[PDB]
Amino acid sequence: KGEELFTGVVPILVELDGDVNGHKFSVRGEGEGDATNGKLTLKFICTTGKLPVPWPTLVTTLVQCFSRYPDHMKRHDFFKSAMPEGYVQERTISFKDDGTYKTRAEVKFEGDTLVNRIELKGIDFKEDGNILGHKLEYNLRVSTPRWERIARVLVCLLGILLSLYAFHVEREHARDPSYKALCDVSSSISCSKVFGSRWGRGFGLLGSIFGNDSALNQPNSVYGIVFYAFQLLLGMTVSAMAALILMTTSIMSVVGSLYLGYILYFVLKDLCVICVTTYALNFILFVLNYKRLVYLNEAWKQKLQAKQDNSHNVYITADKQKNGIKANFKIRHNVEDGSVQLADHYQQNTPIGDGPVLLPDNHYLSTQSVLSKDPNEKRDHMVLLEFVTAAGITHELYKSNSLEVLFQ
Ligand SMILES: CC(=O)C[C@@H](c1ccccc1)c1c(O)c2ccccc2oc1=O
């Protein structure tokens, strides 16, 4: 079925020609592939000299037909169905705040060899950018875990909404005596009585400790806006300086939330869901910044590169209109200063020959990469080892022994 062609070892040859802002280069890689275990191993050499771009930015471009599909999901393996005829893989890689890659590739069998021929076009790249300036780390690890990166963005976005709304209640209630906010309903459930109180501007202190009309003296929500924004955008760089600056400010959040929360319950005897959540949001930020400092202390443990945290998902969906598939995912390169260079991926696959192919359901390919070097090779090279396995398929469980044994 073409899936029979991947039950053993398959030699792999890749070739890539491209020009990026005028700079041309050619890459040739050689190796084999084990689809039964979801593994590939290749050694790429830039035949023209020095690669004008960092090696990790070309890992995604340089044969998903060696993915391991469990016996459940082998119904959804489009890549092996299109073989030996092959498929055409076009991509668009957009680097945030920089240029974009434009690739087209033909993946096909040539004798007993799986061959990938690629053409790349790099357009509108900044020279001293993280790409054409060679500023990226030589790996494909994730500096911040996925489920923690999502926790940061969601809580900081929620913190800005709540603080901006708290600023809305403070400024209008001070100007309009007939104004009632959504949290102003009954006495003991009143925003205006909390923000309009003494402790609502500069935490009650630092006014009459400062001029009481100064610029520092400000509604407490304003400090949150600056804090949540500062935590959101610097919180993606994983550095030494950027780590303690996040932990320093996050401590100031917990000492201010504890102070403010005390006055809310015991002094004012009030209730404010916007205040309680912002306290919770600030406590979540504290423990997330605490993780990174132990991520930095255990640096030796984390140079391993092969950990399942360093994996990337490639979400696939069908394309019945063209008898193919399309996919999207994101890659976050590690730049030498600690921040992140984002790279948007948009993929489209179309079979070469005209035969029965297997259009899949919405699943994804979990991928991991290991980028090594060779001391004997003097040219600009890269040793690669990848791991692709499919996931995202189910098995509801009415027929479960626990529920069934209760219902006899
Ligand atoms: C939820 C807000 O943005 C306003 C809130 C607050 C919470 C944490 C840090 C800054 C600001 C707020 C209140 O909790 C509050 C509670 C008691 C007394 C005064 C308060 O003023 C506030 O602005």
Swiss-Prot record:
Residues annotated as binding phylloquinone: C275, Y279
Protein activity control: Inhibited by warfarin (coumadin). Warfarin locks VKORC1 in both redox states into the closed conformation.
Keywords annotated in UniProt: Disulfide bond, Endoplasmic reticulum, Membrane, Oxidoreductase, Quinone, Redox-active center, Transmembrane, Transmembrane helix
InterPro entries hit by this protein: VKOR, VKOR_sf, VKORC1/VKORC1L1
Chain positions recorded as (S)-warfarin binding sites: N220, Y279
Family annotation (SMART domains): VKc
Location in or out of the cell: Endoplasmic reticulum membrane
Entry annotated with the keyword Oxidoreductase: yes
Lumenal side: 170-220, 269-271
GO MF annotation terms: quinone binding; vitamin-K-epoxide reductase (warfarin-sensitive) activity
Cytoplasmic side: 236-240, 294-309
Transmembrane segments: 147-169, 221-235, 241-268, 272-293
Cystines in this chain: C183-C191, C272-C275
One cellular component (GO) term of this entry: endoplasmic reticulum membrane
Pfam families, alphabetized: VKOR
Family, as annotated: Belongs to the VKOR family.
Name under which the protein is recorded: Vitamin K epoxide reductase complex subunit 1-like protein 1
Origin species: Takifugu rubripes (Japanese pufferfish)
Organism lineage string: Eukaryota, Metazoa, Chordata, Craniata, Vertebrata
